[model samples]
Target: VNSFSGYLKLTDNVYIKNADIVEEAKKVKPTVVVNAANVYLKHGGGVAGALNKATNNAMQVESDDYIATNGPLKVGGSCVLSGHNLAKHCLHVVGPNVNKGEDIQLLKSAYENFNQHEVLLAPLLSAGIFGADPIHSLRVCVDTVRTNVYLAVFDKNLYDKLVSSFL
Candidate 1:
């Protein structure tokens, strides 16, 4: 069910799509698959949980080690790690909790942090469980990303909003 449906292109390379991050990450094997992660990098639930299972919990182990070595990841920060059985690399990025209010910079910071790779697979950061408005989060993602990006959008309603608003 979660596969590439359709896309709206920013360029020949940059685009947004309604797809599954895990499926596309496995298929395309992007250089980096961006995880909409928490400050602790725990792959507890949602997309994080799915990715944890996909990587055989190795992602969680390395995340714990990363926290132990570097301390809890700050909001709006990111850490690149081994993708294990998925893509070549997995970028864990901490997005803003919109409950805090006035989070434009933090949202922008989260999306802008992972542009080092040629091909990137990502979701609309902060739009799920974190309370950020889907439309605003999508805008920040489209605005800040500098490399070729394949966005994995899971929600059918939100997908419509993104495509209609942006495309």
Candidate 2:
């Protein structure tokens, strides 16, 4: 769909649908884009990898530089980075290792760290490589993260609402 079909509110602030992550990340380019990352903030598969390339690896560089000293973020820890390509800023969160364990609260804690933002873009964190349920993770993202949460597949592909500060 070249246009937003509609919006189903997942919460007072969040919504669920679909969009191409990178294209819309560049499109609305929200105040903060949350990356589903590994412990060290290494950009790997899923949203992290896509965001890394889109930002010209700025995400990785920031993480490598920052986390090097601020090391040892246990699962559920998070960090923020200034952005260039996809969005104005980014939040990289380390969820529980899927093969090791899955913590929905890890996503919740990551969402809690963000104090303010009108709209945020995220993937089905822990769903892909992490092996957590995509919808479950998306719900946690919408419920926990502070933003007008947009699932990557919904925004550029079929949804909208990064404006009005918590669409």
Candidate 3:
């Protein structure tokens, strides 16, 4: 179920949400988006695959070119590429590689380091593909400014379960 980082203070804080990704993306037009990506950026499987099909390879082109020149970025590393098929910018992060020692600290780095825009959108990267439990706030997004997250769920129950708790 969707949940917050816990007790609230200022209205400017991270918000956990559950909804269709691309569907909601159109509505929000977020300034920044965190793409849960592997090092390859091949855009294969999971959210990557969906984005691959939606962007019609526009993102793949940029990702491929970046890799050719810079090689694979290390875990907790990322790059902001054209929104192309997404938003104003896509910050593709490499973490919870399931091989990078699956460190939660590494995942935290990906979030903290990528704190660019005031409004950000990201999925539950700590779960599913990464094989981790659902965290209230992922123990990140602790910055003073807001870190808005919109998690995509494939099932009605997951959404109802997660989002209901927070909203």
Candidate 4:
């Protein structure tokens, strides 16, 4: 009852690609990689860490400079920094921590922040250590993002689960 490919179409423009987000992010034209950042914008681990490594830790430096000047980002808030090495810009979006009893609308707002950009290369937000359910957050992703988006999934298991539900 299932046929699968590493890629699946969500809406006419939205898609899911089972690929290394770091590697694929570098190749997009006018590259914009979305970071699943904490309010503090620390690129400690998870998607943020991988992206920081890809940028040769320049991402963290920019983040620090940003906070030094602009202060910490609010949940549902975002800031874009000129990209290092390969990406053209890195959009840091602070997602809500559902485990902390935060409103889910903040996650939706984080996704919405990417709309002003040409395209979004995003991960499944708040569904990691932030404590939101994957499928539920993915649904919110599908519902709110209006611009062209490609959900970049790294784990094969997550890719399978997400694609199975949508495709």
Candidate 5:
């Protein structure tokens, strides 16, 4: 005689390397945000491989949109580049390089324009721009805008805080 087996609950081992997008957004604290960019894409080949690909992809995505690529801006070989309005103010943040620790200049530029009046929209990506995993990208954006983040995708609670603190 065979006995009947009871219910069995099994959990799969899923490794999530990336940070929580919503959580990171909370840290940034932006007013209005739209992540039109994908920062994790690996572009081109060889040394300039990933950066090159990110640049090209950002150019293509930005070009099609009136906000991102207001005019015909040449997509140079640089990993990060900015255009008129790609999501308010498009920030082409370059990913870390083997020779370089982190591009502070690029980060500065992005932060400077984070809440500029001219910028009404902004798209941040990691799959292409950073070539970094999702978590890394989130951390970078959060850290960059923590001090000056007027609005962010994740934190709605901080909105009042920003209004009270900055505005």
Candidate 6:
């Protein structure tokens, strides 16, 4: 038995299998979407992978304006940097060291810079840099939001709790 906060638990009988994250997002009818990840394999690394793929495919076109990072860094045998290609831009955020407070600050800065009153949709909080502790990253992500922020989470319990608390 795995114990969790708020008396949440992962019992022997409970199991999730073969889930498609993108399909789940379509069910919510969200206004804006945010996909945060640590290591992007397709676009080279981290969010870049998904962003690059989306931009390449007609399914996920980039807006005329966007933000991204470009520098000298490496991850997963590939360079981890940011740059703007295609019609859109992406913001390349470097992952924080363990227990570092910078992650929340960086994320907050990114959101704060965006236009207020704009509906922001996001996937699971697990996309943050620290994949080792998904729960902690998720809590910080939730707490950091103040305006119209919608979270598309894979964990049902977390989704329910966040919905009840925020909505």
lDDT of each: 0.80, 0.66, 0.62, 0.80, 0.32, 0.36
Q: What TM-score does candidate 2 reach? A: 0.76
lDDT of 4 by residue, 67-166 (tens): 9998888999889886686477878888898878889878788778878886777888887777888788888888888777778888889888987887
Q: Which of the two, 1 or 3, has more TM-score? A: 1
TM-score ranking of the models: 4, 1, 3, 2, 6, 5
Per-residue lDDT, model 4, residue 57, is: 87
Worst ten in a row by lDDT for model 2: 156-165
| Tens-place lDDT digits, model 1, residues 65-148 | 998999988789898999887888899888886765536579888887867776778888887877888888877777788877
Residues 18-72 of candidate 3 have per-residue lDDT tens digits of: 5556655556566666777887777786666666567788888888998998888
Give the Å shift of residue 44 in candidate 6: 4.7
Superposed Cα deviation of residue 89, candidate 5 (Å): 11
The true-versus-predicted C-alpha distance at residue 46 of model 6, in Å, is 6.8
Candidate 4 wrongly placed segments (more than 4 Å)? 1-6
Q: Quick one: how many clashes does candidate 2 have?
A: 8
Alpha-carbon shift of residue 59 in model 2 (angstroms): 2.1
TM-score for every candidate vs. truth?
0.88, 0.76, 0.77, 0.89, 0.28, 0.41
lDDT of 6 by residue, 1-167 (tens): 22111322122211121223344234433344444433322234334345455445432222212213332322211221222332222323333434443343444344332234344444433343335254444455445545444443555665555445531
Q: Show where candidate 3 strays beyond 4 Å.
A: 1-11, 99-101, 141-146, 150-154, 163-167
The TM-score of candidate 3 is: 0.77
Give the poorly placed runs of model 2, Cα more than 4 Å off.
1-7, 102-105, 114-116, 142-147, 154-167
Model 4 whole-model lDDT (C-alpha atoms): 0.80
Candidate 4: the clashing residue pairs are none
**lDDT tens per residue, model 2, 62-131:** 8788878888566777777877677778877677666776666676775665546666666656666777
Task: Quickly count the clashes in candidate 3.
Answer: 4
